[PDB]
Write a protein that binds this ligand. Structure first.
Ligand code: NAP
Ligand code: DFV
Length: 314
């Protein structure tokens, strides 16, 4: 069901991923988020970047209004985008996300990325020649503002995302730190299991939350289309046939059994309903080591632009 975070709040171990590319109409996010909740999902992952907070927020309020759930049954996550790292922009950004979602609080607010961008109204500020424009921000000052947000009850819990071990220790060793990150949300799948990072997070009681756990949406803007398709993996497919389940269910169950909290995006009613079946079966110890063996040091997200960022975690 849930795992106890280091601030005493509780996070459900299966989460619905709400990101869709801009080519998908905004109305779908409202439709599918209601369906996710209808199928059993209680953890819901959004962000300012996704341009979908209004719709995801309305789906939550929809399912509270019709009596299916109460607000305290729902774990709602947003993320501070990289153009708002400067400490004075953090709380208005969160307050802006609350207003879009028409909620009083988020269950979880994250620094979306350590790679600061130029402040402004543009998600991806690019210079006179189309190159992204970086900013330089001491992320400890950003974290201090995150902590103020938790102390104001605007975020029940705070954490980070796309941080490496070095960027985490910077927070953990900050003088006067008040709140440790409750999680580190990072790319994690059988082709990149992050076992070393996972062990470091366990050592600090930091939850690792896996994104692109099914191999990502393979958007060619960000992912090489000729990379291996995770769900087409023969070991995963052979384990699906063995357990009368499906490659995606295998890949999801793998993370739960390693103590990872796992996200799964789908905008397809039947696949949404299928993913909640992850709680219905068990992987053996022999299957787990076989999935461990698929690790290929492959992060699907690749960008020559962000690779030169003095904050690039890889
Ligand atoms: N913090 C970060 O930097 C970050 C980065 C990436 C993602 N995330 C979060 O993590 C979420 C999930 O990651 P993701 O968007 O990369 O996708 P994902 O969870 O890895 O899913 C990849 C694809 O799998 C398909 N799928 C879903 N269930 C399936 C099933 N049972 N059988 C077969 N295929 C299935 C989906 O297609 P259909 O929609 O057609 O079903 C989806 O496009 C995101 O939505 C977002 O909330 C965070
Ligand atoms: O699929 C993407 C694209 C990518 C991105 C978009 C715009 C940009 O300027 C930089 C990165 O970040 C993401 C973050 C997320 O949480 C989920 C999905 C993605």
């Amino acid at each position: 069901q849930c795992v106890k975070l280091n601030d005493g709040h509780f996070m459900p171990v299966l989460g619905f991923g709400t990101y869709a590319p801009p080519e998908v109409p905004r109305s779908k996010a409202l439709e599918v988020t209601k369906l996710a909740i209808e199928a059993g999902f209680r953890h819901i992952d959004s962000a300012h970047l996704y341009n979908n907070e209004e719709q995801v927020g309305l789906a939550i309020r929809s399912k509270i209004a019709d009596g299916s759930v109460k607000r305290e049954d729902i774990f709602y996550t947003s993320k501070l985008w990289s153009t708002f790292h400067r400490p004075e922009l953090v709380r208005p950004a969160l307050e802006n996300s609350l207003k879009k979602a028409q909620l009083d609080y988020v269950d979880l607010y994250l620094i979306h990325s350590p790679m600061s961008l130029k402040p402004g109204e543009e998600l991806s500020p690019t210079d006179e020649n189309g190159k992204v424009i970086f900013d330089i921000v001491d992320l400890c000052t950003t974290w201090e503002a995150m902590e103020k947000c938790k102390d104001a009850g605007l975020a029940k819990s705070i954490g980070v995302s796309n941080f490496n071990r070095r960027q985490l220790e910077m927070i953990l060793n900050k003088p006067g730190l008040k709140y440790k990150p409750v999680c580190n949300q990072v790319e994690c799948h059988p082709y990149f299991n992050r076992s070393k990072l996972l062990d470091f997070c366990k050592s600090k009681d930091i939850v690792l939350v896996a994104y692109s756990a099914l191999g990502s949406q393979r958007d060619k803007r960000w992912v090489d289309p000729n990379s291996p398709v995770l769900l087409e993996d023969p070991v995963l497919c052979a384990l699906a046939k063995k357990h009368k389940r499906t490659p995606a269910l295998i890949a999801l169950r793998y993370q739960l059994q390693r103590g990872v909290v796992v996200l799964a995006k789908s905008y397809n009613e039947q696949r949404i309903r299928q993913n909640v079946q992850v709680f219905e079966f068990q992987l053996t110890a022999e299957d787990m080591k076989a999935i461990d063996g698929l690790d290929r040091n492959l992060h699907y997200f690749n960008s020559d632009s962000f690779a030169s960022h003095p904050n690039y975690p890889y």
